[PDB]
Design a protein around this ligand. Structure first.
Ligand SMILES: NC(=O)c1ncn([C@@H]2O[C@H](COP(=O)(O)O)[C@@H](O)[C@H]2O)c1/N=C/N[C@@H]1O[C@H](COP(=O)(O)O)[C@@H](O)[C@H]1O
Length: 229
């Protein structure tokens, strides 16, 4: 599947900061109209300040489309997860907290179930060739590999992993083969339609596409047609 994505700040569509308007819902609806089966939202406001998580906007956006939406952005507590699910999102995306407090997040897998959670890992390949997990592009490696972290969560049913390279096709070929029971999502690196063709057959289950759609390089419809071949 293709997974079209938007980043939101105070109701505004942005790309990291370029502004793309205050009307996210017509965009999402047209992404769905073209055949998308899943949408992806990052709440940058909420990531910066969990008091200001855009629950009301997200409720509206989810109600306005007919496909599952996965939503992340500084999810830190059990309460955050439950509030997003209650507002109707299909899956909550968890990056930083999943690296920081794995035993606590394993509890969340037990409470909400693996179908409701996506583990998001920022990865950079270090000089030693190791796929290191980092909590963001602005901070050093955490001293845990992709493999270690994935294997920490497998005993509680881990199913969905979102993997971004922030240091390439080879990466995804390798991790998808090693964990065939996990559905990996690629994120970043899509500059034109050929980057999508390049991911076909790697074993990646979902391709997240953000900026390229906003900049008009191709449509969701063309991306799906290339993806499905
Ligand atoms: N400041 C940020 O940019 C940021 N902060 C957190 N995230 C993501 O949110 C998720 C949860 O992170 P936490 O806040 O829980 O730590 C993770 O996936 C992070 O990568 C962030 N990601 C933002 N944009 C994403 O980066 C990729 C760019 O794609 P492109 O347009 O096609 O080129 C896509 O996945 C976009 O949705």
């Amino acid at each position: 599947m293709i997974i079209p994505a938007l980043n939101l700040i105070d109701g505004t569509v942005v790309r990291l900061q370029r502004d793309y308007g205050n009307d996210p819902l017509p965009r999402l609806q047209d992404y769905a109209a073209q055949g998308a089966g899943v949408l992806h939202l990052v709440d940058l406001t909420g990531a910066k300040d969990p008091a200001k998580r855009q629950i009301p906007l997200i409720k509206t956006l989810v109600a306005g489309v007919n496909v599952p939406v996965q939503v992340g952005g500084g999810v830190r507590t059990e309460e955050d997860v439950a509030a997003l699910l209650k507002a109707g999102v299909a899956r909550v995306v968890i990056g930083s907290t999943a690296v920081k407090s794995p035993d606590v997040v394993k509890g969340w897998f037990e409470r909400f179930g693996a179908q409701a959670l996506v583990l998001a890992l920022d990865v950079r390949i270090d000089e030693h060739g190791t796929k290191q997990v980092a909590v963001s592009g602005w901070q050093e490696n955490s001293g845990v590999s992709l493999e270690q972290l994935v294997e920490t969560y497998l005993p509680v049913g881990l199913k969905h992993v979102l993997c971004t390279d922030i240091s390439n096709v080879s990466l995804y070929e390798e991790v998808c083969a090693r964990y065939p029971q996990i559905a990996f999502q690629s994120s970043g690196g899509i500059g034109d339609i050929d980057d999508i063709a390049a991911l076909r057959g790697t074993g990646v289950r979902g391709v997240i596409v953000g900026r390229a759609l906003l900049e008009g390089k191709f449509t969701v419809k063309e991306a799906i047609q290339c993806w499905q071949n």
